[PDB]
Design a protein around this ligand. Structure first.
Ligand SMILES: CCCCCCCCCCCC
Length: 162
C-alpha cells in the first residue's frame, strides 16, 4: 500500500535471464547508505519456476566480503506481486518491463511504509539506458525516495559494483 504502479499482463516466465541493477533508490538513506546497507542488493539472474514463483539470484556485501545470495519470492493472485519470506511480510512488485531491455521493481514492507520502500531499475546489458532511467525516474517521483544510487558500465561488470 504505497507503490501505485504495477504492470498489467506480466508474463513472469519472460523476465528470466541475467539482469544488471543499473540504479536503485530507497525511502530512507540508511537502506542504501554503505556497501553493507540492508537493501543494497545487486541482481544477477531472475529465475521463474514452472509453478510460477520467482527465484532471484543477487549479490550483497555482508561480513565484509561480496557474497552471492539465493532468494525465492512466492506467487500471489496478482501476477505482478510476489512475497519474499522473512521475519516480515515483505513484498515485491514489478512496476514495468519490456522483457527485452529493462525491468522496474520496488520492494516494500507491509509494516510501516516510509521505512520500507526500495526500488531498482534493472537492465539486460552493462550499458547506461537513458530511457530506462527515464521511466524509473518518473515512476519514482510519486514515492517518497531519499537516496538514489546509480552505477556505470565498469562497475556493472564487477562483483558488488566495485
Ligand atoms: C534481502 C532481501 C531483498 C532481495 C529482494 C530482491 C528482489 C528482486 C526481484 C526482482 C523482481 C522481478
Amino acid at each position: 500500500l504505497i507503490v501505485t504502479q504495477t504492470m498489467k499482463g506480466l508474463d513472469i516466465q519472460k523476465v528470466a535471464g541475467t539482469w544488471y541493477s543499473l540504479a536503485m533508490a530507497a525511502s530512507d538513506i540508511s537502506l542504501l547508505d554503505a556497501q553493507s546497507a540492508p537493501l543494497r542488493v545487486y541482481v544477477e539472474e531472475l529465475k521463474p519456476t514452472p509453478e510460477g514463483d520467482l527465484e532471484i539470484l543477487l549479490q550483497k556485501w555482508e561480513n565484509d566480503e561480496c557474497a552471492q545470495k539465493k532468494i525465492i519470492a512466492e506467487k500471489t493472485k496478482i501476477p505482478a506481486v510476489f512475497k519474499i519470506d522473512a521475519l516480515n511480510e515483505n513484498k515485491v512488485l514489478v512496476l514495468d518491463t519490456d522483457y527485452k531491455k529493462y525491468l522496474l521493481f520496488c520492494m516494500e514492507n507491509s509494516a510501516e511504509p516510509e521505512q520500507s520502500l526500495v526500488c531498482q531499475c534493472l537492465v539486460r546489458t552493462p550499458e547506461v539506458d537513458d530511457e530506462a532511467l527515464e521511466k524509473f525516474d518518473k515512476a519514482l517521483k510519486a514515492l517518497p525516495m531519499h537516496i538514489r544510487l546509480s552505477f556505470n558500465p565498469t562497475q556493472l561488470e564487477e562483483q558488488c559494483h566495485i
